[PDB]
Design a binder for this molecule. Structure first.
Ligand SMILES: [Zn+2]
Ligand SMILES: [Zn+2]
Length: 115
């Protein structure tokens, strides 16, 4: 005699994804430009959440609140050229400019920080 059987192997893995999907029917697509066409052609529409409502009957917890402090800085309403570094009123621009350089005050007008 001589007879027998064998062969036990597997391999039926399924791999497939879809970008967009139709609610009405089960027809999915990859590009929106393709789906839309169907949504109108046939009439169906997307499934993704829909925001066709604004009235929120759901009460919300206490409202929001924040402190609105207030303060001013180095304000000076003058009418004459005056260096903020040293503090010497002038008559003409040059006097001021030629000074900012001759003294290099415009280069050093600040430094560290407090808060
Ligand atoms: Zn459809
Ligand atoms: Zn100066």
């Amino acid at each position: 005699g001589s007879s027998g059987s064998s062969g036990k192997l597997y391999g039926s893995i399924f791999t497939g994804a879809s970008k967009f999907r139709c609610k009405d029917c089960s027809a999915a697509y990859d590009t929106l430009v393709e789906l839309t066409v169907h949504m109108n052609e046939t009439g169906h529409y997307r499934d993704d959440n829909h925001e066709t409502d604004n009235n929120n009957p759901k009460r919300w917890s206490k409202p929001r609140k924040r402190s609105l402090l207030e303060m001013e800085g180095k304000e000076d309403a003058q009418k004459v050229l005056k260096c903020m570094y040293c503090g010497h009123s002038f008559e003409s621009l040059q006097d001021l400019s030629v000074h900012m350089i001759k003294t290099k005050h415009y280069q050093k007008v600040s430094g560290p920080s407090s808060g």
